Amino acid sequence: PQNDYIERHIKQHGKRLDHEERKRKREARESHKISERAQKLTGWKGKQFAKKRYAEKVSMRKKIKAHEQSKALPTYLLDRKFSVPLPKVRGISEEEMFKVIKTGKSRSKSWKRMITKHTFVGEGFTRRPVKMERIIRPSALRQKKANVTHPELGVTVFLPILAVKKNPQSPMYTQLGVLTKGTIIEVNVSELGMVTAGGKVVWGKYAQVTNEPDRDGCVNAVLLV
Amino acid sequence: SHRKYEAPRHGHLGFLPRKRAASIRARVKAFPKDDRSKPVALTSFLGYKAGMTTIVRDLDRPGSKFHKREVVEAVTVVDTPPVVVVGVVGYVETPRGLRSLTTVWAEHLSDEVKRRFYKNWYKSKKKAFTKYSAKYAQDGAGIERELARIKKYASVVRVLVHTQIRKTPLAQKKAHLAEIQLNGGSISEKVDWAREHFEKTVAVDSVFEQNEMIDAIAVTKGHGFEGVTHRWGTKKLPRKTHRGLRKVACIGAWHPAHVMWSVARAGQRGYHSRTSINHKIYRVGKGDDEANGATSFDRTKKTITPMGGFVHYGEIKNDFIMVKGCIPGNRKRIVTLRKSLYTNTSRKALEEVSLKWIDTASKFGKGRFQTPAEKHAFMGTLKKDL
Amino acid sequence: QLSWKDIPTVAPANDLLDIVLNRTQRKTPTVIRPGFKITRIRAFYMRKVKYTGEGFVEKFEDILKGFPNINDVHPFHRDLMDTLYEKNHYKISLAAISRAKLVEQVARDYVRLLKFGQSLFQCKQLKRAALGRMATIVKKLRDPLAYLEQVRQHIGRLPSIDPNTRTLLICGYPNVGKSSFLRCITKSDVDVQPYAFTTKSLYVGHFDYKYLRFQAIDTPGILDRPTEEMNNIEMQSIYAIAHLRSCVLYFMDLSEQCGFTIEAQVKLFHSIKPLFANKSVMVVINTDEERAQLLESVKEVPGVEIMTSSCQLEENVMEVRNKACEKLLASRIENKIHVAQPQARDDVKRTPFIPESVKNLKKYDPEDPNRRKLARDIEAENGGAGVFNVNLKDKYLLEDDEWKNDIMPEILDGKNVYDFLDPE
Amino acid sequence: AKSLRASSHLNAKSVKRRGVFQKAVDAREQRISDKLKEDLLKQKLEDLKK
Amino acid sequence: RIWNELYKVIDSSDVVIHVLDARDPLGTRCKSVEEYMKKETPHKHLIYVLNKCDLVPTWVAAAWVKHLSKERPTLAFHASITNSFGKGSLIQLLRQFSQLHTDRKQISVGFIGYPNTGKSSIINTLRKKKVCQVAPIPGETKVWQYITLMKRIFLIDCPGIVPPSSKDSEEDILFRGVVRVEHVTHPEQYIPGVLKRCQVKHLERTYEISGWKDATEFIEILARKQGRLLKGGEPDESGVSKQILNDFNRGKIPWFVLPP
Amino acid sequence: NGAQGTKFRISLGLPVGAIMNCADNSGARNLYIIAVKGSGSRLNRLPAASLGDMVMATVKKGKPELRKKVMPAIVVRQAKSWRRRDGVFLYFEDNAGVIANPKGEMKGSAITGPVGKECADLWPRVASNSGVVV
Amino acid sequence: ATRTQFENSNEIGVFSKLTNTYCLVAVGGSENFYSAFEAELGDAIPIVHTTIAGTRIIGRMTAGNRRGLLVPTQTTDQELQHLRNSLPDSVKIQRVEERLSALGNVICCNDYVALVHPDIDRETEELISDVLGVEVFRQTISGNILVGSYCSLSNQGGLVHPQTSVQDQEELSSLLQVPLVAGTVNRGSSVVGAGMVVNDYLAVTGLDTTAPELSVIESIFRLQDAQPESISGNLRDTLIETY
RNA sequence: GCAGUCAAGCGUUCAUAGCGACAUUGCUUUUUGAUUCUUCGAUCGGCUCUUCCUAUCAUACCGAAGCAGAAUUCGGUAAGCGUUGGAUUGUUCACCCACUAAUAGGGAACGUGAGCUGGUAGACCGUCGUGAGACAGGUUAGUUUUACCCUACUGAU
RNA sequence: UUCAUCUAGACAGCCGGACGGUGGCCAUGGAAGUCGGAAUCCGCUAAGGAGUGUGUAACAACUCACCGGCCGAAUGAACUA
């Protein structure tokens, strides 16, 4: 202890008698043992071994490439229909959206429908009484913010959702606020500092969701400029 | 599913099938390996179990916490009168196993072994070995030819001996017969030893001595048809369960289509043949010399046999072997003492046991006196005396 | 405090990821089927997410609790570890790990989402999503863990110093002799080659003086350095001299040796004398008039004491050591047994009873050929500790020696011999 | 722990056997043969009482 | 299970009443739920109701109401089907909120607070009959229930909640009606807290003893008085302490905290 | 560890959930709680031990400063029928309890009543604090 | 002085009793504790293994001076015979019938005085007052009534445990007629009698006792040439900064 | 996951279309380990007893680690042997403190439904209904009962 | 299958050379080809990098990249199936 004591020890006495020969022989046998591990290591270990070996091959290829290589529009027009980026999305059945819920001791009444997918309810939601509610939009499947990307600027932002204007499946779903793929939403954009001609600040814009958030907790979307 | 709580098995699957043994006399299934360098020696002996008793010993065991301290211990007593030799068997090697190719018997034999060969002795004419004794005529051509056969072939030699049940208090009149292996060298010398030893006895001092670790092979005390709880050691169901509580309730949730060999059912408990090894001899006592139960520390003349004799057994008027602890079998049985099959690397088989005292009190109750003289002296003179 | 060595290993990000995910794939079950109940499928993937979260937070907690709080320890250790490890980087890395311990949020959110999974594919994708976000968080921890493993190895090898104990610093210029002073005075593995910064760290040694543990500290070096620029090796020396409650021995080496001139030596002394205001200083010369004026230079400081001596002789070393210890203990007791007596109660005489045998006796030299056998060795001869049977007899004192191996009878017919056994 | 059939423990036992234990095991054989021969000679002496 | 019911009740409610014990409102406050309601749900109203105002003097109630009206309306109340206080004021406030929420077609009012504060009893007081089960033991309401008045106001009963603020203590949690004292092991160690909180004059007027020292001696005096002793002569300190701790919370022993 | 000697076997009398006596004047009267050190692990079986065995315990009756506080210490009397390897079966009037730290050192300084021979031989500081052995 | 350890314990009462004319030890696995005494003593005096009622705790089971040796009721006839045979006729050995069987805890003694537990009298204890040796005193060491454990003694000086007061020390040194001091053993132990055995010429304790404690022991018992108990005059502030 | 960058290759008989492995950027909230830790709508758990899998918790043998020693971390062969006692039903799709060498995961049922044990008829409160009654609820009380047959299994002729 | 080297001697082995301005410039307690940042030039050459790695506190020493001697005829790389 107290400092680099083994470095001192190696300076004073020195490593072993049988250290350099054995290291040379390990480096020599590694060529055999690499192939031995390839023809062996059944399963996940062999898969990972192959992945590592492929990545190592690519690294050395790029290194040698770097070695051997190290040995009309203007600037402003470079870098440059009204169709949304997702028309014709997969169609959702009413069965795949609504789950049946049964009420009573002997459960015999169903009349209740739970929406299985992620939802946007609003700002003043305030659940209905149980005897009067039929549509159930559970609290975990309730989104307030989305992950909206501007195609330009290569930038994304975690913006608060303002509304749902168009879910392409059965405009009932728009009023329920179902955020399925291809759904069009109004999001706030005051964080970006956008302003129209006249000096009026823009604080709302349309965006289209690109993912199926029933499979991912994320609601990812693309701005419609 | 995965049982939620691991626990060990109930019972040992090696001591199966738990059936009645096919003979009252357990069969020795292995004798020690022969070294042909060493003298001729018996590998085993026969005896009759006679109760148990208690001793005190002075323990010179270094490392222990009774080092140089006294220790009370139980011991078993086997009545071991001398054993009589009556025959020889030679066991040749084959690529199927070991085969006997000849057996040779002695000239004269006792009514005991004849009774062993017979099953209704009081009616028979007792014609057992007449023609063999006749075959023991002038030169014994047949006897010598079969002995020479054993010398030539046969590989290993065992000796047929019997007991002297006549000497014990047991009411049987019929001797046991057993093959006991000879473990010295020179098959010729083995055969010569046996030839010279026909019609002659071998005492237990000539097969064992103190501080020796021996194995007891016997049969264990049948109790009869017994249930799961006492035959394997299972838990009991709480109370007033359906179809009873002294059993296994079930196998669980999962569904087989058969009952396995592993699920602890009812049946016979006892009369199984057992081989219990490494019991240390504490005394090789002799009937010729009284004061067997006495000791260097005691100097109180008395034999080991307690007051009123042993229970369900008589007196020890014969040579006996004392071993420590608990052997298989109950009193009045036939046990075989074998010697250890292997050199034992424990200091337990080196320590020279020394006794201080032996308990010769009555086992027919709570015994307080070692001798009737002590009882007389303590109680004092009674009404009947004078 | 004092040897923060018990810190578990800090693996890099990829290895930590492989560990925590393979543990999940191994311990938790791997098989479910579509025909099974949706509750079974949900419980499966929930168990996976929860176990994966628990692994990461266990690992991170082992880092956070095992590592010391660089504030909240002692100012000396704080400043030392700051000049070594850059306190800002240290705290920033540990805060990164704390905020990553996020994983809990992901696990809770995705489990609560998994409660509503209506299909094996949905549940599988949610599980994959949780583990992937965990992996992203850990991938963003590549550099701090590399920093922290190195700091772990270093801080484990640091020495255990108590700042409050009786201490003495050994200071001077590079290449003086102050380190093989430590070598000679005390057990210590230190290098003494002839060049400036042979040692780059503090080295500690212990000794016992007057039935008290002292600790001597060799410090690598100080240069004259106008002090708004200096390196982390000299700032160790400065912080050690400033913090600790020691005596301090400045070695001058009055000689052409050292590769350093006496003017520069006294210059450094006058530079660092503000640290000496409360530190019990001594100067030692390790063998013209201006060079002597430069010595009364330093004598004119109020609290100081000069000594001349050598590494050539080994008694002046112990001399000056004891001087330094005595200088310290005095104002230690300043900054801070009763035996009773009879009072003459009687005339009855009392005196030590000792036989002539012990006074005629010879001590036990363990390294003499001709000596006493001492039953240890009789054991070694016969057989080891657990085999040798000692005879409790062979020591006993009797009228006749031929009866050594006798036994006394204990019991006769009913009676016991010890009860009837009188001489008369 | 180290099992019964552990190679190292069995090698240690193998080294112990050839020494202090086999001597004690071999002495008993000579003793018991010396007793076995006398139990024959006494029977012969009793046979020669007739 | 309980906090699921809490959040369900809140999400179903348009108004949230927060029931406090006038003995220890700041103890019974639950600030984390108010912070959640601030950040998550500003469209809810979150008012206070001091209850058990009949156990403390009028000036303590006025002081607490003054201290809390600075931030939240804070009515005072006493719950009883026969002899009540604050019923009309609370009715007026609820119909005010109803008049504000004229479009919803109904307005739901949740009852939040610690256990044993009087939520069920307040609802039973508004309806003026036994609608909800009531008991002096804490956990009688185990699951929510809707109750109706005006065809326009829906009361919701909630179970009791305590947040896991670990600055709290088992003693502080005991001296708020939370636990059933039958299940605690050594009830004797808490009687010093009872002496600390309560006044000796009320405490001797209640049990009619006198002049004790040493709460360990207090218990044995009370046990010798009540004949509450074991087979032999050991007085049962455990059960007597359990009874004292039940009395303290149930209000057989008068006690109260002063405000600033 | 802390004890001097081997794990020797004497019969078990004191399962979990057993209130036994303390007679020293450290302040305690009683000892209850769970644990026994050097206990096996078998389904459905109680941890119960003696042989000067160390056990976890609380003061059910005593001073509040040490009530509510788990502590280790050692059995000195049992009242079950124990066997001495030198002859006879032994048993005491009662169970007895008393208090210590994990190294075998006592919080109290003297013991009342007899203490077991094997318990004192196994624990030194018990033998120093005990005036009465057997 | 001397430090050593058997099996691994710093408490010497587990193994031994020691006076000017004999040394009792316990029988153990190894003859290393016996050899530790044989080294400093040689064959000059009796060094004797054996147990007391099959127990090793013999300094705490026994007590005696150069004139004799008291052993308890639980002692067997054989161990008693063994002690008689192994010791000369100069030391009278006696088996005592008493309720308090730990004589080395109940008694602290030297060749000229003895302290005892304040509990029961006896015929031959009131007779031992002047028969066997000399003065007995029923006293108590700062409330600790286990005098042979909480106080070590010899003819030249005495040690007590550190919670003893100056007043009680002066009161007890008057009875013993020799100087006392309060100290600790084996890294902070109040129990001195078990942790240490001492006499007019030699001291044996554990490996863990510190150098200041050894220096006090050496001082108060007059071991090194010369240490007449006010060498504490020299080592004043060592003990100050130690404690 | 979404949207991107790059480029090893593929490349309508395209050089300047498209596809694209390995790497890599942004979004997830923060930079100084203060995070008071703070739960948000799921249509089972517990006894006896047996075996099996390895994706090994411990024990056995090895490798690499700034691995001084001591302890520990990562990993290779390995399923031979073990993998507990309890508290908690205002509930437990669980957690708590202890003992321990260790307190590893699962299957053979739950790929409709199958040992033994907890979790329709009467009555009350709540919501709704004109009502009969129903339920968003909640509480309470509340009778399946083999084997003597074949096979298997265990013992016995 | 394609591309390359080869009796003006290929591949593999041993041996030797592997220089000079120059310890190139910043930096530092020290860093001389080899902790780092940025230049990365010329000279003499058969060839010899302001240097491929081991190493030193720094130098040193060894090494490869490159050249030559001995050896005496085939060899290497990338791809496809």
Ligand SMILES: Nc1nc2c(ncn2[C@@H]2O[C@H](COP(=O)(O)OP(=O)(O)OP(=O)(O)O)[C@@H](O)[C@H]2O)c(=O)[nH]1
């Ligand atoms: N004349 C003399 N020279 C000494 C003596 N001791 C050391 N030296 C010299 O000191 C030189 C080495 O310096 P160090 O002992 O390492 O002192 P230092 O360099 O200041 O120690 P550090 O700064 O901690 O590394 C040696 O070359 C010795 O010649 C001594 O006793 N007498």
Ligand SMILES: Nc1nc2c(ncn2[C@@H]2O[C@H](COP(=O)(O)OP(=O)(O)OP(=O)(O)O)[C@@H](O)[C@H]2O)c(=O)[nH]1
């Ligand atoms: N003196 C007094 N006692 C009250 C008052 N309100 C309630 N109580 C008593 O407090 C006891 C317990 O309070 P609860 O009415 O159950 O209040 P709660 O715990 O929120 O009710 P649950 O929701 O059913 O748990 C009741 O048994 C009442 O006797 C009050 O205003 N004054």
Ligand SMILES: [Mg+2]
């Ligand atoms: Mg140097």
Ligand SMILES: [Mg+2]
């Ligand atoms: Mg309540």
